[PDB]
Symmetry: C2
Subunit: 402 residues, 2 copies
């Protein structure tokens, strides 16, 4: 058992001062040191009077296999990005070898993230993910818009799913991802989702990431038409949007991006066991705009970084700074608090892990960070944490310091 007394605790929902945290694997008590040592005389006390304790972040959406990308893929516009992925992935993917994967995951921890949602298209990231101390939801992604080759795509997905499933434990979950409504034909999607139903697996889907997707699904026109004509020899979207969305009705689903989702889709998703995953940097850099947080207010959201295929870092502090800036008309002190909650508790909820909150009974998944100096107004703490922090002093996963 250990006790840490910081300047303040961000729970994340509240700011607690004049209390410490007793923990082992889980958070056991939150009280004054005076009271804690009565209960835990065996716990050494660390006084960190110029530090803050907050939960470890969740990052519920990242494409680890693309972690060698720096400037190879094309930014600025979604369809050119997708062409660039198709062009470069055969070389880019193997460039992220075991050492690259291992280092990338270690750096996630070092920047204060303690739980991730890994989107895996090819499965060669499995060993690195099971080796990591992180909590991981390992989403086995399926893709395939041609009904005639669904069998091959399904068989690969199924094999990857079962390869991951043997490694399940309290910190590692095997899951299912559907690439998108434009790239996964209905029947193949349903087959993959039936595996999720059978096992109670979490599900992720990219939904309405781009305006091109919006127009293609709605009208069978727009910039995606040339892409489907050239790349897939298809003249029309293979899916009816509403029918596709209904496939997710009985599952726990992460709807990623969601920038271009419409009011009807939002009402439907609000009725589901669903979370939106907001990836502000990726959306802005790919010419996809900015998710409107009023429009989606009926559905809980969490923050993620996406992969290094459409981001310059996997550091949640960088993501949170960008989030402040792409929602520039949200008053900063209150929005910073919202952001910290949505990067910790909300993402843990999306991933289904017992953490993201400094509360009794939660796993001791925590960050110890420096207190911004000269703080006048304690309610400004959330904002100053985002602005001034880039690396925690200590990061704990189930009480173990990394």
């Amino acid at each position: 058992m250990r006790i840490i007394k910081p300047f303040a605790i961000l729970t994340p929902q509240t700011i607690i001062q004049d209390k410490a945290v007793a923990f082992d694997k889980k958070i056991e008590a939150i009280d004054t040191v005076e009271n804690l040592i009565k209960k835990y005389p065996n716990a050494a006390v660390e006084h960190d009077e110029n530090s803050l304790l907050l939960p470890g972040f969740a990052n519920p959406h990242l494409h680890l296999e693309f972690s060698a990308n720096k400037a190879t893929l094309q930014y600025g516009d979604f369809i050119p990005w997708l062409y660039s992925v198709i062009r470069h992935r055969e070389d880019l993917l193997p460039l992220c070898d075991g050492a690259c994967l291992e280092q990338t995951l270690s750096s996630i921890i070092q920047t204060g993230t303690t739980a991730i949602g890994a989107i895996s298209s090819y499965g060669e990231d499995l060993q690195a993910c099971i080796d990591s101390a992180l909590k991981v939801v390992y989403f086995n992604e399926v893709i395939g818009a041609n009904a005639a080759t669904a069998d091959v795509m399904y068989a690969s997905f199924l094999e990857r799913f079962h390869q991951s499933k043997k490694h399940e434990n309290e910190r590692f979950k095997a899951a299912v991802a559907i690439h998108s409504p434009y790239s996964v034909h209905y029947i193949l999607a349903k087959r993959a989702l039936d595996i999720a139903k059978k096992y109670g697996s979490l599900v992720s889907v990219h939904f309405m990431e781009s305006r091109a997707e919006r127009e293609w699904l709605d009208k069978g026109s727009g910039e995606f038409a040339k892409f489907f004509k050239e790349f897939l020899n298809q003249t029309r979207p293979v899916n009816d949007t509403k029918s596709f969305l209904e496939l997710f009705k009985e599952l726990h689903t992460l709807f990623v991006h969601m920038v271009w989702a419409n009011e009807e889709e939002i009402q439907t998703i609000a009725s589901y066991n669903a979370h939106i995953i907001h990836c502000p940097i990726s959306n802005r850099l790919l010419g996809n705009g900015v998710l409107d947080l009023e429009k989606i207010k009926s559905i809980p959201y969490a923050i993620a970084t996406d992969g290094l295929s459409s981001n310059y870092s996997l550091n949640m502090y960088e993501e949170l700074k960008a989030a402040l800036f792409v929602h520039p008309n949200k008053e900063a002190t209150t929005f910073a608090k919202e952001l910290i909650i949505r990067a910790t508790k909300a993402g843990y909820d999306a991933l289904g892990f017992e953490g993201g909150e400094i509360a009794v009974g939660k796993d001791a998944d925590m960050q110890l960070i420096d207190l911004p100096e000269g703080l006048t107004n304690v309610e400004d703490l959330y904002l100053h944490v985002i602005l001034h922090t880039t690396k925690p002093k200590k990061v704990y996963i189930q009480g173990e310091e990394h």
Copy 2:
């Protein structure tokens, strides 16, 4: 004489490959190494084939005296920020002692800035500024909304101006700043601007930073009314906006912030020898919104950071990232190019120094930075410079490496 051969030169307006730069104090030639050594057999050649050369940044607006602020001033809303400045400045200002000023200026250079516009309200930053290797326009700021005490405010301004003027040389210019149209009564402003006229000094003014200012000047109402009533015992704005703006007609002026400027003001300023100074982080953090770059397209703009009184860093790379994000609907590859030009050449133009461009005859004020790896499309270089760079490998001011 020296020669550097990088992967590419950002001039900033163009990307040049397969050429090197010969320089001493000034850039002397841009040509292949083969051609340069014929002209400059005395110049050693540095091959930096995994680097880029670009101009040093200009940062035409910074309040150096507030460089001890981290979390003391109140963010989120302009008038509460101003109250916090009034409350805390007596203690905050002396906290930035000589060592703080010296370190702050050194860090500006280390982050790739080679020229600044320093706004000085009290003059205790003069020694540090003259000591720095930076190019500095040292703006002596005047403030005072009470016509009855204009003499005292004017005398202090005049003394500070002349104290700075004795230090003028090719890299250090004495200049004049008018705090704002709400805080400097017309007659005092005109007296200070007459000094600028006499000496041909550059001028800076904060103009339409906040909506409160807009409403106060336009209608004599809004959130500034309580402030003027309580703090100054004034019931009405002391200035007519148009009359105040006309004071700047015959001067070279930097109009800072400009978020809330109206169409009439923009047309007037476009007819003046004037630049807008865009401070995206400061404006967003103080609840002032975002400058609309279409609205002001008729007036050249440059990027600045403001002081650490309303920013978390003085690093232009951080400012440029934030600029990408607060203008999220500007296509990223082209906007990044615009930003790099507006942080180098445009800011040098605003400050009146011969730099900000890698061109023959300009001062050799340059940055050598790492080339982002794996670059497929060279036109993406500007974007990847912003995303992946935080500290140059070398920074030159008039050819001297720092």
